[PDB]
Design a protein around this ligand. Structure first.
Ligand SMILES: *[C@@H]1O[C@H](CO)[C@@H](O)[C@H](O)[C@H]1NC(C)=O
Ligand SMILES: *[C@@H]1O[C@H](CO)[C@@H](O)[C@H](O)[C@H]1NC(C)=O
Lengths: 114, 54
């Protein structure tokens, strides 16, 4: 059974950094993207990026280019989200997601989030 | 044409081990279900990789 287990809560002061972990189980960790999406209190979902564990290729959203670093390990089937230069408005809940919705057409060739 | 035979030059399997051959489009739909040319293949990445092919 597919499962993504993340690291524990973090309390930081402005300027500090975090490195959140996302460990996967139940599938071959290298077959699908690992997306990162955050949700601030009360507001909606904001997509941050993806990293493909097999190639290491990364896609960062524009707001998060430079402030963020997405990595992997593959040996322990884990992906990492490092955020730098934190600010009070970065307080939120950070979700990881699996890009396992394999596309049906080359028209919209997108691996959606299972 | 005097003589004419259709043969599978690059079989769908065996010929593209590290690429994905299943690509189809709704612009080439057979029975209202997306398909694609029967004499060509759409090669795409397998597992975040499109390795150099020859
Ligand atoms: C596909 O990848 C495997 C990995 O070891 C390699 O041995 C094989 O030669 C590759 N085939 C082609 C057609 O690139
Ligand atoms: C394809 O060739 C380029 C140019 O040397 C190289 O950077 C890349 O790693 C090659 N890819 C494979 C799968 O061999």
């Amino acid at each position: 059974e597919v499962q993504l287990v993340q690291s524990g809560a973090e309390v930081k002061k402005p300027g500090a950094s975090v490195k959140v972990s996302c460990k996967a189980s139940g599938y071959t960790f290298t077959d699908y993207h690992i997306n990162w999406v955050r949700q601030a209190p009360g507001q909606g979902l904001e997509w941050m990026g993806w990293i493909h564990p097999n190639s290491g290729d990364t896609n960062y959203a524009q707001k998060f280019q430079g402030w963020v670093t997405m990595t992997r390990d593959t040996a322990i089937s884990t992906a990492y989200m490092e955020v730098n230069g934190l600010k009070s408005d970065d307080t939120a809940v950070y979700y990881c997601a699996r890009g396992g919705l394999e596309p049906r057409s080359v028209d919209y060739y997108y691996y959606g989030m299972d | 044409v005097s003589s004419f035979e259709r043969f599978e030059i690059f079989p769908k399997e065996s010929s593209w081990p590290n690429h994905t051959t299943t690509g189809v489009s709704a612009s080439c739909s057979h029975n209202g279900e997306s398909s694609f040319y029967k004499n060509l293949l759409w090669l795409t990445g397998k597992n975040g990789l499109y390795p150099n092919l020859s």
